[PDB]
């Protein structure tokens, strides 16, 4: 069950967001935890191509070795907040799982400067959902959330404290793909 009507960041800049580039998961937090394992790797390129709003996810579970892509086209609910579709692909954009009723996740965007994110989404596939899942993001993969996404956290009445950090698992990220699937 989703249970939370994520707030946008006021004056989101879009297009900085949306600029073509990687965003690394680097800690997360389902308010439903036992949705999602403890240790995961996660990351999306985001931007626009010939005019579509898109975006493209790597998830890889580092314990199973579970890996899978996406390519998601957006649409627009209100500023920084989206409803996504997906095809689950290969990592060079073949369709393995196409765009489905059904299958779609909201994405809103709490909190975002140049370099680090905060983010709310709600998936589905079709009566089944994947709790509210938190997660923040930075540019690079390595980074330690610094005082602007946490305070963001915070102000989110969240704990960061108390987020799932990715960063003990060893993940490596194919950024080539990321940001080639966002044309897929
Ligand atoms: C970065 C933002 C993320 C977005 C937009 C997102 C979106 C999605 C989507 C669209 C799927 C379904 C893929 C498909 O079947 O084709 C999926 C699956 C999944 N995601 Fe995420 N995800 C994100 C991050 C994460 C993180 C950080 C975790 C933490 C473990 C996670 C855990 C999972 C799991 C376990 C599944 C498989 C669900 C199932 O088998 O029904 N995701 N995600």
Not at 155 to 174: G, M, P, Q, V
């Given at each position: 069950?989703?249970?939370?009507?994520?707030?946008?960041?006021?004056?989101?800049?879009?297009?900085?967001?949306?600029?073509?580039?990687?965003?690394?998961?680097?800690?997360?937090?389902?308010?439903?935890?036992?949705?999602?394992?403890?240790?995961?790797?996660?990351?999306?390129?985001?931007?626009?191509?010939?005019?579509?709003?898109?975006?493209?996810?790597?998830?890889?579970?580092?314990?199973?070795?579970?890996?899978?892509?996406?390519?998601?086209?957006?649409?627009?609910?209100?500023?920084?907040?989206?409803?996504?579709?997906?095809?689950?692909?290969?990592?060079?954009?073949?369709?393995?799982?196409?765009?489905?009723?059904?299958?779609?996740?909201?994405?809103?965007?709490?909190?975002?400067?140049?370099?680090?994110?905060?983010?709310?989404?709600?998936?589905?596939?079709?009566?089944?959902?994947?709790?509210?899942?938190?997660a923040?993001?930075?540019?690079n993969?390595?980074?330690?959330?610094?005082?602007?996404?946490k305070?963001?956290?915070?102000?989110?009445?969240?704990?960061?404290?108390?987020?799932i950090?990715?960063?003990?698992?060893?993940?490596?990220?194919?950024?080539?793909?990321?940001?080639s699937?966002?044309?897929?």
């Amino acid at each position: 069950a989703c249970t939370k009507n994520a707030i946008a960041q006021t004056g989101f800049n879009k297009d900085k967001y949306f600029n073509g580039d990687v965003w690394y998961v680097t800690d997360y937090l389902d308010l439903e935890p036992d949705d999602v394992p403890k240790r995961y790797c996660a990351a999306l390129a985001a931007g626009t191509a010939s005019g579509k709003l898109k975006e493209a996810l790597y998830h890889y579970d580092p314990k199973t070795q579970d890996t899978f892509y996406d390519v998601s086209e957006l649409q627009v609910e209100s500023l920084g907040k989206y409803t996504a579709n997906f095809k689950k692909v290969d990592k060079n954009g073949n369709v393995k799982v196409a765009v489905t009723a059904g299958n779609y996740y909201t994405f809103t965007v709490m909190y975002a400067d140049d370099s680090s994110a905060l983010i709310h989404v709600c998936l589905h596939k079709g009566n089944k959902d994947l709790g509210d899942l938190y997660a923040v993001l930075n540019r690079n993969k390595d980074a330690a959330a610094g005082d602007k996404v946490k305070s963001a956290v915070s102000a989110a009445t969240l704990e960061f404290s108390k987020f799932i950090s990715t960063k003990e698992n060893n993940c490596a990220y194919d950024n080539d793909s990321l940001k080639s699937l966002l044309t897929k």
